Symmetry: none
Subunit: 123 residues, 2 copies
């Protein structure tokens, strides 16, 4: 998917182009991943902002019920976590193993992301 490809590579202009030509912002991979999942996991803030502006679901879940916030948390993408937080992402959402994004942060040793979410997440 070209929307997934450009978002994954941080190709903002390409992503903007794909969405312009009618690319589907919430199109999902075979694993249930959306372009916002990749942008947030790879730390592509600009692309994530584009997707969010275009209307992409900030709380989209993949086949493991992981949201873009799980992706940013587990890969330690602090700027992306912050973006998700100011666009009302659900921080208490659990994946299939009953883990919230702050849990995934901890498990992946992303302690700076844990320190941020500790301020906002009430579990």
């Amino acid at each position: 998917s070209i929307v997934h490809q450009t978002a994954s590579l941080g190709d903002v202009e390409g992503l903007k182009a794909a969405l312009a030509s009618g690319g589907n912002k919430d199109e999902e991979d075979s694993e249930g991943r959306t372009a916002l999942h990749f942008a947030c996991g790879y730390g592509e803030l600009k692309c994530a902002q584009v997707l969010i502006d275009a209307g992409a679901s900030v709380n989209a879940v993949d086949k493991n019920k992981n949201t873009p916030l799980h992706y940013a948390a587990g890969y330690g993408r602090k700027e992306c976590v912050s973006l998700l937080l100011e666009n009302g992402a659900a921080v208490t959402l659990q994946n299939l193993d009953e883990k919230t994004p702050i849990d995934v942060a901890k498990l992946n040793s992303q302690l700076e992301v844990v320190k941020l979410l500790e301020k906002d997440a009430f579990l």
Copy 2:
């Protein structure tokens, strides 16, 4: 702390006893939490009323700069949010991640608390 313990468990009579024997209503934990933080987070309205009556700071901030209203909001304790509101709690107060209690409500999917604060919070 016995004032924290009783408040946390909803032990009104015990809390009243602790404050009677000179327990410190605004004593804080190692995390900067007061007994009112626990009462509000656990939804212990009676205990919260006791603390407030005894003079406890309705706007006390913990180490993450979260107030009792952040605690009631994030855990969806509507009755406690209402109590805080009629005792002049500051609804625009931001924590260390620049989030007000209505922001924390939203992030924690406490939509009924969001609907209440929408009526009073001007941001």
